[PDB]
Sequence to fold (23 residues):
Amino acid sequence: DALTLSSAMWFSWGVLLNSGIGE
Fold:
């Protein structure tokens, strides 16, 4: 439930980070 939904929301943002520094 909220575990996969939570960690998931967290994963997306973690991508954005490495996606801005990584391009």
